[PDB]
Amino acid sequence: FVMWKFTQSRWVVRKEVATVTKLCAEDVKDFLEHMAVVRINKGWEFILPYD
Amino acid sequence: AASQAVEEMRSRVVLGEFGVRNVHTTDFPGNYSGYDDAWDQDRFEKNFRVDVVHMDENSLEFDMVGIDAAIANAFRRILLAEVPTMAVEKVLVYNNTSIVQDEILAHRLGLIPIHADPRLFEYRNQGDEEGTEIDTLQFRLQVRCTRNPHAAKDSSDPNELYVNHKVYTRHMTWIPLGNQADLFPEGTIRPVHDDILIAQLRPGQEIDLLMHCVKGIGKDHAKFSPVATASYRLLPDITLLEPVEGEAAEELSRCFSPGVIEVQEVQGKKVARVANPRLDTFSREIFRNEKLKKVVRLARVRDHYIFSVESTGVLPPDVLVSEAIKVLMGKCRRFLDELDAVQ
Amino acid sequence: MIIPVRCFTCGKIVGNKWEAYLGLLQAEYTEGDALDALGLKRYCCRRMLLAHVDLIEKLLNYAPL
Amino acid sequence: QPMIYICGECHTENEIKSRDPIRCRECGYRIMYKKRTKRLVVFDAR
Amino acid sequence: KTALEMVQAAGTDRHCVTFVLHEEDHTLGNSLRYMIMKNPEVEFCGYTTTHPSESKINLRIQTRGTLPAVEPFQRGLNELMNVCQHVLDKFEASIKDYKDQKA
Ligand SMILES: [Zn+2]
Ligand SMILES: [Zn+2]
């Protein structure tokens, strides 16, 4: 689901993923840290640019 | 001259680079030659005044002009300790299976404020652990955590898996004693914040207890303190020895608080002036600039005290100040009656 | 173990502002702006909320249940 | 008199009498805690 | 049993008196010290704490002439009571007019 959200849009909200997937905060954080970085006022951005 | 220095010593408190000067109250008869500092009730009633600048729920700010540091500190200490309120003292536990310790649980419950009006109750006599209708209140807390019968297959979050897993203070139910139900309308006797997290539970664990609350003062224990932060500060009055203009004036706006020093273009050039010395916190950053040290004179007004009283929500802070003044009056009356009984 | 109800220095009610703070951590708010939005002006409550470690869930993971 | 205990992993109420091998049904764990008392206990919030 | 008087020595001199006040602290001590120091007939006024464990204070009053040093005590108490009444009335009036002008 996280990878699909990243394919649909470059910016992914952590709270929306936590609400949809019904998972705890630490699991969503580990999922995002593997492929995203925290950008202030924008959420989570994919670590690599569009190739 | 000498008169100006005497007036500055007797009216202002100057803050130097290394230390504060003129901090002691000196307006007393015999200390000054050209001043008759003898007590005068008429002059005190004339000069004294109270001006409230901000007043909302659980927050008050008011300036008192004409009072001294001794009476101000007395009021502050009475508000901090000598104002009686209602707080949890006795905890009767029935099969506490929580991970949180029983003593720690009782200590956390004791710190929870109670919205009950303390003036309508009395101090419990020595002993008498059973308690009476007049001088005690009972709060029942019974929370049984169990698994949610309807939840998702994964349910990683504890909110979906379990119910009542976080025992908030809203679960506390006031149990009337005698005729307290008729005297107090429903909804008056309750926890103040209603959102304080007492403990966290798991399925199988249960927390069952009764809480006996009695009247008490903050001096005995800090849990009876009604005010969260009740303090007072001297009103600052920043003065400019020489007119400061140009870009250095902007430095003034960056040296003091952003809201005290304002720059204006009277003739197309920026000149700084004191707009609202109240907002300044006296960070003493002007001493870093070498040139701007001898151009300003930071000072505090001796007979102008801004009181800020943020309460815990038991009662509005104006009633708190009134009750503090009443407690001081009661102490004075008790000592006068004792002296009269002696003579 | 758990968030204290009262602040050690001043005594402001801080236990009720813990989980909401966690929500501000679940949101995009940083530490400073979240502590400012919670209404903690003095630094004592900021230290109380920031330096607190949530060990209650780690213990409940070892609870009998 | 029914004496009740709690297992260390099943956490089920097991009734065993005196001089019994400490065990628990539907498992094999051998750590048996005692349930909390029913007597009233008074605590001070100090 | 709360406030007790003590003379300076066995001679029972009314010029130097010590009032021992029970269940008190620095608040009332400092307030009464400030309220009675302004009395021109008081040479020496001073309050102290015997020990932080026990809740009691000792005030000492030494007058100028032949004052019994008990009359300045009652004078300071009455002046402090009047000041408290005045500040209470002023604060109540201020709060009331603030509530009126706010709405
Ligand atoms: Zn604090
Ligand atoms: Zn078992």
Side-chain angles (χ1 to χ4, degrees), chain C residues 1-64:
Chain C
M1 180 181 301
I2 202 180
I3 170 77
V5 180
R6 293 291 189 90
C7 180
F8 294 160
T9 72
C10 67
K12 178 184 296 298
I13 293 292
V14 84
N16 66 331
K17 300 181 180 60
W18 166 249
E19 65 281 349
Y21 173 76
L22 295 181
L24 298 178
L25 294 185
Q26 300 303 321
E28 208 181 1
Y29 289 90
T30 339
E31 290 77 15
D33 56 357
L35 292 179
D36 295 0
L38 287 177
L40 310 184
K41 300 180 180 60
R42 47 193 62 89
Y43 63 90
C44 62
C45 298
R46 303 173 58 91
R47 175 262 309 176
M48 186 66 59
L49 273 191
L50 185 57
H52 169 254
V53 52
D54 209 10
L55 292 178
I56 179 60
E57 60 271 19
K58 301 303 177 60
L59 296 180
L60 291 176
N61 294 330
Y62 287 74

Side-chain angles (χ1 to χ4, degrees), chain B residues 268-310:
Chain B
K269 53 181 178 59
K270 298 181 299 300
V271 53
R273 62 174 299 271
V274 278
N276 186 17
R278 176 190 303 268
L279 300 180
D280 190 9
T281 60
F282 272 176
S283 53
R284 302 186 307 274
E285 307 299 328
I286 194 64
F287 299 148
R288 302 184 62 179
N289 188 279
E290 174 67 27
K291 192 264 180 180
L292 268 57
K293 284 187 302 180
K294 301 178 181 60
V295 309
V296 302
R297 202 280 304 272
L298 300 86
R300 288 289 191 91
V301 184
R302 170 167 283 99
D303 53 355
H304 196 156
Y305 302 91
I306 304 176
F307 279 77
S308 300
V309 175
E310 304 176 359

